[PDB]
Amino acid sequence: FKFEFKFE
Amino acid sequence: FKFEFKFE
Amino acid sequence: FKFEFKFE
Amino acid sequence: FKFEFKFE
Amino acid sequence: FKFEFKFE
Amino acid sequence: FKFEFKFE
Amino acid sequence: FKFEFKFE
Amino acid sequence: FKFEFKFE
Amino acid sequence: FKFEFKFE
Amino acid sequence: FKFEFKFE
Amino acid sequence: FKFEFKFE
Amino acid sequence: FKFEFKFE
Amino acid sequence: FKFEFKFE
Amino acid sequence: FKFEFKFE
Amino acid sequence: FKFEFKFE
Amino acid sequence: FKFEFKFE
Amino acid sequence: FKFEFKFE
Amino acid sequence: FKFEFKFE
Amino acid sequence: FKFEFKFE
Amino acid sequence: FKFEFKFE
Amino acid sequence: FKFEFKFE
Amino acid sequence: FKFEFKFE
Amino acid sequence: FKFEFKFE
Amino acid sequence: FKFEFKFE
Amino acid sequence: FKFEFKFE
Amino acid sequence: FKFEFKFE
Amino acid sequence: FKFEFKFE
Amino acid sequence: FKFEFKFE
Amino acid sequence: FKFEFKFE
Amino acid sequence: FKFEFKFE
Amino acid sequence: FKFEFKFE
Amino acid sequence: FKFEFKFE
Amino acid sequence: FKFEFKFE
Amino acid sequence: FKFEFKFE
Amino acid sequence: FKFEFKFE
Amino acid sequence: FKFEFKFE
Amino acid sequence: FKFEFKFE
Amino acid sequence: FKFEFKFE
Amino acid sequence: FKFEFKFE
Amino acid sequence: FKFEFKFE
Amino acid sequence: FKFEFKFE
Amino acid sequence: FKFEFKFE
Amino acid sequence: FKFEFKFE
Amino acid sequence: FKFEFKFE
Amino acid sequence: FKFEFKFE
Amino acid sequence: FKFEFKFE
Amino acid sequence: FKFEFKFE
Amino acid sequence: FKFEFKFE
Amino acid sequence: FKFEFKFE
Amino acid sequence: FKFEFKFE
Amino acid sequence: FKFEFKFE
Amino acid sequence: FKFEFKFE
Amino acid sequence: FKFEFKFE
Amino acid sequence: FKFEFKFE
Amino acid sequence: FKFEFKFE
Amino acid sequence: FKFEFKFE
Amino acid sequence: FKFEFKFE
Amino acid sequence: FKFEFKFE
Amino acid sequence: FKFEFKFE
Amino acid sequence: FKFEFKFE
Amino acid sequence: FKFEFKFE
Amino acid sequence: FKFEFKFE
Amino acid sequence: FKFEFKFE
Amino acid sequence: FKFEFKFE
Amino acid sequence: FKFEFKFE
Amino acid sequence: FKFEFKFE
Amino acid sequence: FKFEFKFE
Amino acid sequence: FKFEFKFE
Amino acid sequence: FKFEFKFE
Amino acid sequence: FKFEFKFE
Amino acid sequence: FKFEFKFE
Amino acid sequence: FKFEFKFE
Secondary structure, three states, X not given: OOOXXXXX | OOXXXXXX | OOXXXXXX | OOOXXXXX | OOXXXXXX | OOOXXXXX | XXXXXXXX | OOOOXXXX | XXXXXXXX | OOOOOXXX | OOOOOXXX | OOXXXXXX | OXXXXXXX | OOXXXXXX | XXXXXXXX | OOOOXXXX | OOXXXXXX | OXXXXXXX | XXXXXXXX | XXXXXXXX | OOOXXXXX | OOOOOXXX | OOXXXXXX | XXXXXXXX | OOOXXXXX | XXXXXXXX | OXXXXXXX | OOXXXXXX | OXXXXXXX | OOOXXXXX | OXXXXXXX | OXXXXXXX | OOXXXXXX | OOOXXXXX | OOOOOXXX | OOXXXXXX | OEXXXXXX | OXXXXXXX | OEEEXXXX | XXXXXXXX | XXXXXXXX | XXXXXXXX | XXXXXXXX | OEXXXXXX | OEXXXXXX | OEEXXXXX | XXXXXXEO | OXXXXXXX | XXXXXXXX | OEEEXXXX | XXXXXXXX | OEXXXXXX | OEEXXXXX | OXXXXXXX | OEEXXXXX | OEEXXXXX | OXXXXXXX | XXXXXXXX | OEEEEXXX | OXXXXXXX | XXXXXXXX | OEEEXXXX | XXXXXXXX | OEEEXXXX | OEEXXXXX | OEEEXXXX | OEXXXXXX | OEEXXXXX | OEEXXXXX | OEXXXXXX | OEEXXXXX | OEEEXXXX
């Protein structure tokens, strides 16, 4: 159950 | 169940 | 069951 | 339950 | 229950 | 309960 | 309860 | 309760 | 209660 | 209460 | 109450 | 109260 | 009150 | 009060 | 009050 | 007051 | 006041 | 005042 | 005689 | 014989 | 016979 | 006769 | 028979 | 007849 | 029967 | 009839 | 029956 | 009927 | 019944 | 009916 | 009943 | 009814 | 009752 | 009713 | 009552 | 009512 | 996060 | 062979 | 997220 | 065989 | 962080 | 068999 | 850091 | 069997 | 560094 | 059984 | 380096 | 039983 | 190198 | 019982 | 190399 | 009882 | 190699 | 009692 | 910023 | 399967 | 910087 | 399952 | 630099 | 489960 | 360089 | 559980 | 080089 | 619990 | 080469 | 508890 | 080669 | 407690 | 080969 | 306490 | 082969 | 105290 959050 | 979140 | 969300 | 957090 | 925080 | 902290 | 802190 | 500290 | 400190 | 100290 | 000091 | 000292 | 000194 | 001295 | 000296 | 001397 | 000398 | 002498 | 099965 | 089935 | 099932 | 099961 | 279940 | 169980 | 439970 | 229990 | 509990 | 207890 | 408690 | 107690 | 206390 | 006491 | 105190 | 006292 | 004092 | 005294 | 599996 | 799996 | 598989 | 697992 | 498991 | 586990 | 476990 | 453990 | 344990 | 331990 | 212990 | 110990 | 001990 | 010891 | 001891 | 000892 | 001793 | 001794 | 997701 | 996310 | 997450 | 994160 | 985390 | 981190 | 940590 | 670290 | 540590 | 370290 | 240590 | 070390 | 040590 | 060592 | 030692 | 050693 | 020793 | 040794 992955979750990535890239800001840039 | 991956979830990608790019912001830029 | 991927899900991408690109904002930019 | 991974959680990725990139900032750059 | 991993948690990564990359800054760079 | 791992916790990753990269700074570069 | 691990904790990594990479600086580089 | 491990604690990692890399500096390079 | 480990503690590592790698410099290199 | 271990304490690791690498220098290379 | 261990203490290691590796230089190399 | 051990004390390790590696030099190589 | 041990003390080790390894050189190699 | 042991004292270890390795040289190789 | 031990003292070891290993050379090899 | 022991004294160890290894040479191999 | 022991003294050991091992050569091998 | 013992004195040990091994040669093998 | 392997069998890979990826999901995500 | 190897067999992959990558769904995503 | 080997069998993998990687969900993520 | 292995069976791998990854989650994340 | 071997069985792994790696959650992360 | 092993059974592995990883968490993290 | 062997059983591991590695938390980390 | 072992039972391993790792923490860290 | 054997039982380990390794904390670290 | 052992019981291991590691700390570190 | 045996019981170990190794602190280090 | 033993009881081990290590420190170091 | 036996009791050990090894400090090192 | 023993009692061991190691130091080193 | 027996009592040991080994210093080394 | 013994009492051991080692030194070395 | 017996008493030993072994110095070596 | 003995008293042992070793030296070496 | 329920799971169901059948083999053979 | 045969295989079956359910998620959620 | 049901799955069905047959080989051979 | 059969298998079942629940998380959370 | 509850867990449930059934085999066989 | 059966299995159950709770964390936190 | 509470723990709960049941087998069989 | 049954098991229980508390840290901190 | 408090500890609590119950078995059976 | 029961168990309890305090450090520091 | 204080210690506290209770069994049974 | 009960137990107590102080170092330093 | 002071020591303190109490049993029972 | 009771116990006490001083070194140095 | 001074020593101090008290029992009972 | 009481005890005292000096070396050197 | 001087010695000093007192009992009681 | 009292005791005294000289060597060499 | 707000987000909401539903599946099934 | 339900999800939620909040940012900023 | 702020963050909030909900699952289930 | 609830989560929170704060930065800066 | 500041950081804060909450779970549960 | 609560956490805190400070740097610099 | 400075560092501070809090848990619980 | 409280922690502190200083470097340089 | 300098270093300082505090716990508790 | 307090600590200090100096090098060079 | 120089070294210095403090505890307590 | 104080310590010192010199080398070379 | 030279060496020097101090304690206390 | 003072010490010295010379080699070569 | 040469050697020299001093104590006290 | 003084010492000397010669070899070869 | 040669050898020489001095004490005192 | 003086010593000598010859071999071969």
